[PDB]
Amino acid sequence: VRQKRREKQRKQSLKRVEKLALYEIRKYQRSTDLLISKIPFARLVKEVTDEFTQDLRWQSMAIMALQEASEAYLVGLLEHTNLLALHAKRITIMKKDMQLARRIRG
């Protein structure tokens, strides 16, 4: 159980060392990794594939590429709706703002 001892040592190291909303915009714009929790998204795409299926398997890198592409499409639609939101003199976005960009793209 040397891997378990190394994991407990790394967890202890993270617990000891590693452990006005304007900061989060510039904070999460320089982040590179994913931002959606992994295994609920895997359960969700398993439920989506149950509509169009048979015990269809799943490689892990395929679900990783799906999570990356879905996060990219969502931040693309959100970055495009922010401009239409501020264009209508709304700092706070609304569901009407994510209707025209969902309409005029297709």
């Binding site: 359960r43 169009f52 969502l74 931040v75 970055e79």
Partner: protein
């Protein structure tokens, strides 16, 4: 339910990645609905690829080919 697995602070952090100051409470359900729609629209082609190929593994090659067919192509997982 698995459609509510992407919770409220997840979409909050996504919006902070996309640069929003304040967000409303009506955003999250439409975000989840358009996410389910995009996932269905890519997964139908990604599983017809693996159903033609006499396979049951949805391979990364199949999802990058389905992404290249629908415009939004990824790099690094084939092609």
């Amino acid at each position: 339910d698995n459609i509510q697995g992407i919770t409220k602070p997840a979409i909050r952090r996504l919006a902070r990645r996309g640069g929003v100051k304040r967000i409303s409470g009506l955003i999250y359900e439409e975000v989840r609905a358009v996410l389910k729609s995009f996932l269905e629209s890519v997964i139908r082609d990604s599983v017809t690829y693996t159903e033609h190929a006499k396979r049951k593994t949805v391979t990364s090659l199949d999802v990058v080919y389905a992404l290249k067919r629908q415009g939004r192509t990824l790099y690094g997982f084939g092609g």
